């Protein structure tokens, strides 16, 4: 019945849970711009940052579907958790492309190219059971 979205902070490149407050019309600032729509979003866990003005590219339906480990393939673009400054700890949700997958009786390792804005190639993903499917169209 709702109406739930993810908002991408433009400087970290990560996606955060958010809600849409207003939709306004951005009149072109220059002739080489078209009249586009602005989405006014607020972050669910950061209401101190007030409202942010974003475009449709940085707002999308909220991630709901987890891709099981057995169903992860090399080359898929997914939303996973990663911490660039502490790769062994919990981090933020970035879009990434799975680059390497390995499984043994003991270990389950996954490497992906993490998009942050720049790109990070072959990041060792810790949370291989919390890989989300990106919702489209």
């Amino acid at each position: 019945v709702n109406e739930y979205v993810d908002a991408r902070d433009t400087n970290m490149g990560a996606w955060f849970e958010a809600q849409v407050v207003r939709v306004t019309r951005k009149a072109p600032s220059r002739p080489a711009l078209e009249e586009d729509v602005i989405y006014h979003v607020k972050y669910d866990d950061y209401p101190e940052n007030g409202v942010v003005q974003m475009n449709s590219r940085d707002v999308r339906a909220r991630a709901r579907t987890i891709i099981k480990w057995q169903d992860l393939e090399v080359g898929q673009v997914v939303m996973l958790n990663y911490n660039p400054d502490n790769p062994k700890e919990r981090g933020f949700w970035y879009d990434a492309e799975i680059s390497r997958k390995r499984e043994t009786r003991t270990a389950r390792e996954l490497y992906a190219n993490v998009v942050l804005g720049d790109s990070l190639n072959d990041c060792r993903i810790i949370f291989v059971d919390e890989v989300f499917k990106i919702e489209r169209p």
Binding site: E17, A63, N81, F92, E130
Partner: peptide
């Protein structure tokens, strides 16, 4: 959807 587990953003 159930809330995701995410770290907290830090200041400079």
């Amino acid at each position: 959807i159930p809330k995701r587990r995410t770290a907290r953003k830090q200041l400079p």
